[PDB]
Write a protein that binds this ligand. Structure first.
Ligand code: DCC
Ligand code: DCC
Ligand code: DCC
Ligand code: DCC
Ligand code: K
Ligand code: K
Ligand code: K
Ligand code: K
Lengths: 139, 135, 140, 148
C-alpha cells in the first residue's frame, strides 16, 4: 500500500557531478504528498484556501544509488505513523527507467497541521478527512 | 550607476552540462532586486509585509559565456524604464576575480505593482530610489 | 497550421512563493522540462550523443506573464518551433491553465547546439535527426 | 566553533504558506559546505575538477520555527564525525535578522568521498587536507562517565 508519484528526471534536477542534486529527492516528497491531498482530501485542500497550513516539522533521506537525467523515478509514499497532531510519511524511491524497479533512496517527512496566524503558526489536530484517507496507506 | 548583488555559484546552481542552469540567472534578478528594496526602499518593503505585491510581468536573459560552480558572479542592476504602474530593470552579469570583470550574460525584468491582484501606481519612495540607477 | 508538443504539470507548493502565485522562474524551468521530454520521445540519437560531447545550451530566453497560476492548478505548456538556423533552435511556448484552457503566459527560448571542445563550448550544426523531428512542429 | 554561511532569505525561497519552503534549508547545507571548501580545501577542490566527487549519502533537518522573506539566516556548520570515506556535518540555523540569534532549525548531512569510474562511484579515503580543515570545527572530547 503506497501512493505513487512518477517523475522524469530533468536537466534542472542534475548538478555538475552528473547525478540528481540531493534536495530534489526531498522536493519530490512534497510533490507526492500534494498529489495525494488533491486526490484524497478535497475538504482539507479547501481549508488551505482559508487558514489551514500543513508544514514540515522534520524530514530525512538516505541515498543508495545515483539517478541521472532522463531516468524515471517512482516515489512511493506510505504511512509510517499518525497521532492527533502530526503525520509521518515514509518514501521509497525506485528507478523504473528500464527493467524491474530498483530502490535508489529512502526517506521520511513529518508534517504538522496548523492555522496560519500573523504571529506564527497555531497547531491543530489532524483533520478527520486526512486521517481517514491516510489510514489506507498504513502497514 | 548600478546596484550590485554578488553570489558564490553553488553546486545546486549547476547542471550535468557542468555550467549554471539557465533559470538561476533569472533567480538572481529577484535576489538582486530584493537586496535593493531592503537597503533603499524600507517604506515599500514595509507595505510588502502587508498587501503590496510586486509581480513579474515579463523577463528575459541572454547567455554569452558559461558560469561554473565556485565562480563569483556580480549581478549589476540598472533602471531601464518606468511609468506610473511598471518598472523595467536591466541586469548585467559579470564573472569577477582578481582580474578584470568579464560580462557573461545580460537580462531584463519588468515588474508591476499590485495590492492583493489589483494594480496600483509605483510608490514614490520606490520611484525616487530607482532614479539613482537611471541613465 | 503548426503543431505543438505538450508538457503538463501539476503546480506544486514548491512552485509557489509568499504571494501565492507561481514564482516566475518556474515558467522557464517548464521550458526545459518540456523540451527535454520532446528530445526523449523524438530525438534518441541526439540524446545518445548527449551522453558524450554534445551539449545543448540556452543562448536566450524570455517569458511574459498574463494571469496567475496557483498551487494545484494544472498548466499545459505548448511548444512549437519558431525558427531554426544552422547551429541554433528557437522554440515558442504558450502556457494554459487547464484546471476550457485559459492562456496565462507566453515565452521563447533559443538553444545552441555545441560540442565541448578543448577551448570551450563550440557551436555545431543542428543534428539531422533533431532538425527533422523539430520540423514536425514548424509552420505548414 | 562553527563555520558560518549567512543568507538573506529571498522571495524565491518562500512558498504559499508564507515561510521558507523546507527544502531550502537543505540547499543551504550544500551552499555552506561549498563555501567551506572554497575557503579551506583548495587541493580538494582541485581534485574535484579531476575525478573526486563528494556525494550526499544521507541528510535530515528539523524545523522549529518559521523563516520569512527578508530574514537573514545564519547557518552554522560543525563536524560531527569522520569514518574512513564519510564525513558527517551538523548544522544549526539561526534567525539573525534583528541582532540576537534565535534557533529556528537543526539538521545533519553525511557525504561520501568517491572517485568516479566508468562503472560508477567508488568510495575513497577522506583527503588529509579536508580532514584537517574540518577538525577546526570539531567539538571538544565529551566522553561518558561510565566505569566498565
Ligand atoms: C566538507 C564536505 C564538503 C561538501 C560536499 C558537497 C555538498 C553536497 C553537494 C551535492 C552533492 C549531491 O547532491 S550528490 C547526489 C545525491 N547522492 C547520491 O546520488 C549518492 C547515491 N549513493 C551512492 O552512490 C552510494 O550509496 C555511495 C557512493 C554513497 C556509497 O557507495 P557504496 O558504499 O559502494 O554503496 P552501497 O554499498 O550500495 O550502499 C551504501 C549503503 O546503503 C545501504 N543500502 C544500499 N542499497 C540498499 C537497499 N537496496 N536497501 C537498503 N539499504 C541499502 C546499505 O547500508 C549500504 O551499505 P552495505 O550494505 O554495503 O554495508
Ligand atoms: C529542442 C532542443 C532541446 C532543448 C535543449 C535543452 C533545454 C535547455 C537545458 C538547460 C541548459 C542550460 O541551462 S545551459 C546554461 C546556460 N547557458 C550558457 O551557459 C551558455 C553560455 N553561452 C555560450 O557559451 C555561447 O554564447 C554559445 C556556446 C551559446 C554560443 O557560442 P558562440 O556563438 O561561439 O559564442 P560567442 O561568439 O563567444 O558569443 C555568443 C554571442 O553572444 C554575443 N556576445 C558575446 N559576448 C558578448 C559581450 N560581452 N557583449 C555583448 N554581446 C556579446 C554575440 O552575439 C556573440 O556572437 P558573435 O558576436 O560572437 O558572433
Ligand atoms: C526594485 C524592484 C523590486 C522587484 C520585485 C522583486 C523581484 C520579483 C519577485 C518574484 C515575483 C513573482 O514571481 S510574481 C509571479 C509571476 N507573475 C505573475 O504571476 C503575474 C501574472 N500576471 C498578472 O497577474 C497581471 O498580468 C499583472 C498583475 C502583471 C498586471 O495586472 P494588470 O495591469 O491588471 O493587467 P491585466 O489586465 O491583468 O493583464
Ligand atoms: C499527508 C500530508 C500532506 C502533505 C503536506 C504538505 C507537504 C509539505 C509542503 C511544504 C511545507 C513547508 O515547506 S513548511 C516550511 C518549513 N517548516 C516550518 O517552517 C515549520 C517550523 N516549525 C514550526 O513552526 C513549529 O515547530 C510547528 C508549528 C511545526 C510545531 O510547533 P510545536 O512544536 O507544536 O510548538 P507550539 O505550537 O509552540 O506549542
Ligand atoms: K511541493
Ligand atoms: K527572489
Ligand atoms: K530541464
Ligand atoms: K550546493
Amino acid at each position: 500500500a503506497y501512493f505513487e508519484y512518477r517523475h522524469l528526471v530533468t536537466f534542472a534536477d542534475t548538478n555538475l557531478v552528473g547525478n540528481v542534486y540531493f534536495t530534489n529527492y526531498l522536493s519530490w516528497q512534497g510533490a507526492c504528498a500534494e498529489r495525494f491531498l488533491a486526490e484524497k482530501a478535497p475538504k482539507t485542500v479547501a481549508r488551505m484556501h482559508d487558514d489551514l497550513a500543513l508544514v514540515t516539522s522534520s524530514c530525512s533521506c538516505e541515498f543508495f544509488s545515483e539517478l541521472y537525467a532522463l531516468d524515471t523515478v517512482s516515489v512511493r509514499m506510505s504511512l509510517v505513523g499518525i497521532d492527533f497532531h502530526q503525520i509521518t510519511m515514509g518514501f521509497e524511491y525506485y528507478r523504473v527507467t528500464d527493467g524491474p524497479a530498483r530502490l535508489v533512496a529512502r526517506g521520511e517527512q513529518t508534517v504538522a497541521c496548523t492555522l496560519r496566524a500573523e504571529d506564527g503558526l497555531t497547531p491543530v489536530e489532524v483533520p478527520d478527512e486526512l486521517r481517514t484517507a491516510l489510514d489506507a496507506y498504513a502497514p
